[model samples]
Target: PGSILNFIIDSSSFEKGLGNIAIWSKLNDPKLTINAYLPLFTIQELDFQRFKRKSVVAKRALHFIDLLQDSTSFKLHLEYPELNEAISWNETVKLCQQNSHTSLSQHQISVIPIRFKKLLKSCYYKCHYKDDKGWVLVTEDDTVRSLATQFQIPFISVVEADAIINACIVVNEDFKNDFLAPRAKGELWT
Candidate 1:
């Protein structure tokens, strides 16, 4: 079965953020159907910090937001993850409770950490058991990975992501030169 691929990038994946995603969006491999989604929840979190804390990390996050703002390859979800019926509020509380640092009371369900929201979305997609598509959470945070493991959600590490992007470029040779030229000025060469 040639299942279409679905990937959701978590906020933490941008810790060492680059335009790798922008490049990934350009990969046109006829043999592999790929889809990436950016949740509004992730945008809100990144935007909130850019003004509130003015952190370099947050700045990097903002740049990432700008890069994907118009990139049509990555579909955008304007709704919060909670809007999905696949995972309920109570389930979210249970899932958050599993993490020592993110524990929350039932009444506190109205407001949740962004990580909780991101994980909820990943779990939501995973619950939809379908043979036509496969889903994965692309996150760099260990805690996010742990939560994903708890829900049996498949995931990919950032390093693995680089490899995949590189492989994609390998297949589509046209992207290699232009993609590397900018990196030569600033950012990692590889």
Candidate 2:
């Protein structure tokens, strides 16, 4: 009967990006239940274009993963709502890794499909639970938000840490302070 805030980190959230997701882990209170998903494709692309400058930002994203998995309050899960099969997170990465196609599909070999599928599922989750919960996708990309808006997924344009605190606060107004205060690692800030 209340909002079910599902925060997801888009690809741009890493690198020089706001990294508000990391901030949320430090601030979210341990009584409220929330899940901040880190899509597999974002994970895929974070290290995809190797041996180039793209790895710079990609490495940053991976570092956040390292910290998020190590000593953080909130979880940055590697997930995909697309099919919701029994595949593990590593399997998702494996799928992305094993994928291949013809020359025409070479340009399409990027993470676009993986990201869009996650977007679709984010909207689907909201639609499926229309009577009880709220679903919001966090991203700084104009195109991503535009597509989400087109298909009806609530979004937050988190440009910095300040914006993220405010965004989480706005979503569950009663939990404003929960997102503003300090929290312990892996404490289930619900």
Candidate 3:
């Protein structure tokens, strides 16, 4: 058994890690699927760095391009969800379908509950999922991490090199052996 990880890496981690970030996921499961979404604002932030001639990070940001493009590691998702990523999602799905043998695999999306269809317009509302499915947000921002925790969403705020490297380390016991389970599973914080 396995789970899906929808990860969003912020520009800070990208800038801080330099070329090293590109190799961080090599230890992860070979069949692992990830969505390293670069929000529009983060794109803008990266763009701002590009204009600075003295900024090594500006040139360094390019190092992650090919890594993110590598289908085996990441999907290179570039879109802001709240601003309407329906078109992007459709395009991604179409591409996934077209290249069924190549890369892109199908992704998980929630079915809107009839009780709140209009209230929640998207299939990923509340980031809900069941079974061997999970969601993750990787960022160093306190507010983003706190908000996700408040909502009971899995989040990782890795600021250290080792921490980032450990991100992809799959604890086999968590999903591989479901018999050894947690005693209680509620509340975001203890």
Best by lDDT: 1
Global Cα lDDT for candidate 1: 0.54
- Cα deviation of 91, candidate 1, in Å: 4.8
Q: Number of clashes in every candidate structure? A: 0, 5, 0
lDDT of 3 by residue, 1-190 (tens): 4334565555555665543446544435554555555555455556567775455564456555534544564456665546543323443233224433443223322232221221122223324421224445555555444434433445564333233334544232156443231111111221
lDDT of 2 by residue, 51-153 (tens): 3455554665576576665222354466653544433333323333343121213243343565565544534443332323454666666777655654455
| Model 2 worst lDDT run, 10 consecutive residues | 181-190
| TM-score for each model | 0.59, 0.55, 0.47
Off by over 4 Å in 3: 25-28, 52-54, 66-68, 80-133, 143-154, 159-190
Whichever of 2 and 3 has more lDDT, that candidate is 2
What ranges in model 1 sit over 4 Å off?
1-3, 63-87, 91-118, 126-132, 168-190
In candidate 2, how many Å is residue 39 off? 2.0
When sorted by TM-score, best at the front, the candidate numbers are 1, 2, 3
| Tens digits of lDDT, candidate 1, 1-190 | 3324566776666544345555655655554445665555456666666777675665765675565543333343434645554545455445455544545455554554655655565455454433325666777677667656655566775556656555443121176743331220112223
